[PDB]
Design a protein around this ligand. Structure first.
Ligand code: AMP
Ligand code: CA
Ligand code: CA
Ligand code: CA
Ligand code: CA
Ligand code: CA
Ligand code: CA
Ligand code: MG
Length: 439
């Protein structure tokens, strides 16, 4: 597209907004930028020529714009943007700018949880085929930074927020991995409004990869000729368990024994299925996609085995910052002995009731900590203990573990009551697991 001579206004000075600044500068357009933070991080990366307004939005800049480029962090329902839309001013996001310029096929991945794992895994499947793939869309690698005429395939993690401002995506393969009651501040009309944003990913997609176990991932008008499904018990891509073993199964045929993979956990196996379906639909060779399943290590803090010693598996799932993530970790969980489950942190007022149905059975102990520890213990008090910190909880459970047990940090809560971020929380869990269970 051609932006020469337009008044372009960018909202947001995080890395996404900065990538938009770069995009226009590279095209000879000097945009204006604004951010409601007084001292946003990206301020000192801006060139001198870019006019900027911080500490609030500048309404007169928005109402004078030919094009407003809105960070995913501001709602279309915000009154300033509603006023600009009411006036007929075009509002887009970074992904819309990307899709107008992308010259290679796009695999597009959204969903409440698992987006990063599946995006990274499709990327690895492409690399195993020798494809110069561009993988991004997460906050640390905005899509616009990937644009390159040398790129042969784009694999994008897309949020519901980005999809709201995107109209030009034509994915070769697209998925909604799952939809759980999260992100509700931005979606006041509830789960179906949140879903509606994600459903945009299937518009003009050639193949839709849907979750056979989550009906909210089906296209808005239902399954159609484009749809390929993944699931636990059935679907085009599903899991087969027998004789103590598990296989990935595709269209009625085992394709891989999961013992050849490095990932753990039923939900990572369905992530692997979703990735394979997307890779297949994108035209990547099956053989190299399976090879990537055997070499992919997984992402840190995503149901990550940080220690297996004396028959005890210590699992860092610190990225489980919400109930839906922890629910998926507990669903289908395979533990020969006792599950020692670490829950805690800042729960953000969530309903933890959904977790209750997994916490019966005589082989479960709860170790609850952080701001909301007491609420988590109340799920099943007779098997629960409460401490202030994660370290205290781990020191309680460590003398009790026996071969066959699992120690699972899947907190269902944010980490910011006690840690700098979830990475620090998972890194501290890994250190303590080695201190306490490594010998
Ligand atoms: N298919 C899934 N459904 C629900 N949660 C998941 C799924 N896959 C991964 N997760 C968890 O969701 C969080 C975010 O994963 P990711 O988006 O891959 O960083 C981590 O706690 C993951 O272990
Ligand atoms: Ca931004
Ligand atoms: Ca802002
Ligand atoms: Ca609270
Ligand atoms: Ca106690
Ligand atoms: Ca306490
Ligand atoms: Ca956190
Ligand atoms: Mg079902």
């Amino acid at each position: 597209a051609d932006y020469q001579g337009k008044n372009v206004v960018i909202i947001g000075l995080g890395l996404t907004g900065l990538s938009c600044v770069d995009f226009f500068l590279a095209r000879g357009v000097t945009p204006r930028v604004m951010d409601t933070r007084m001292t946003p991080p990206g301020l000192d990366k801006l060139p001198e020529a870019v006019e900027r307004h911080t500490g609030s939005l500048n309404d007169e800049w928005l109402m004078a714009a030919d094009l407003i480029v809105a960070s995913p962090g501001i709602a279309l329902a915000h009154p300033s943007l509603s006023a600009a839309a009411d006036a007929g001013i075009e509002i887009v996001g970074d992904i819309e700018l990307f899709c107008r310029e992308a010259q290679a096929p796009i695999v597009a991945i959204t969903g409440s949880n698992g987006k990063s794992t599946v995006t990274t895994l499709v990327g690895e499947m492409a690399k195993a085929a020798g494809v110069n793939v561009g993988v991004g869309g997460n906050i640390g690698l905005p899509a616009l930074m990937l644009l390159d005429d040398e790129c042969e395939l784009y694999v994008l993690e897309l949020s519901s927020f980005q999809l709201e401002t995107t109209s030009s995506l034509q994915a070769v393969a697209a998925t909604i991995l799952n939809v759980t009651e999260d992100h509700m501040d931005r979606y006041p009309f509830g789960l179906q409004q949140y879903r509606a944003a994600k459903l945009r990913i299937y518009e003009n997609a050639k193949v839709c990869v849907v979750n056979a176990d989550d009906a909210l991932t089906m296209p808005i008008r239902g399954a159609d000729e484009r749809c390929v499904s993944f699931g636990v018990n059935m679907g085009d891509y599903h899991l087969n368990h027998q004789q103590g073993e598990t296989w990935l199964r595709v269209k009625g045929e085992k394709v891989l024994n999961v013992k050849e993979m490095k990932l753990s956990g039923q939900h990572n196996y369905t992530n692997a299925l979703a990735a394979l379906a997307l890779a297949d639909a994108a035209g990547l060779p099956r053989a190299s996609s399976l090879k990537a399943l055997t070499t992919f290590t997984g992402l840190p803090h995503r149901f990550e085995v940080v220690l297996e010693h004396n028959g005890v598996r210590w699992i860092n799932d610190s990225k489980a910052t919400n109930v839906g993530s922890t629910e998926a970790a507990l669903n289908g969980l395979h533990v020969d002995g006792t599950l020692h489950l670490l829950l805690g942190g800042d729960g953000k007022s969530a309903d933890f009731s959904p977790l209750a149905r997994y916490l019966n059975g005589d082989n479960v102990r709860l170790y609850c900590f952080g701001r909301d520890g007491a609420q988590l213990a109340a799920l099943r008090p007779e098997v629960a203990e409460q401490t202030e910190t994660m370290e205290q909880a781990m020191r309680l459970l460590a003398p009790r573990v026996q071969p066959g047990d699992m120690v699972l940090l899947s907190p269902a809560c944010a980490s910011l009551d006690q840690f700098k971020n979830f990475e620090q929380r998972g890194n501290e869990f890994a250190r303590l697991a080695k201190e306490l269970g490594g010998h």
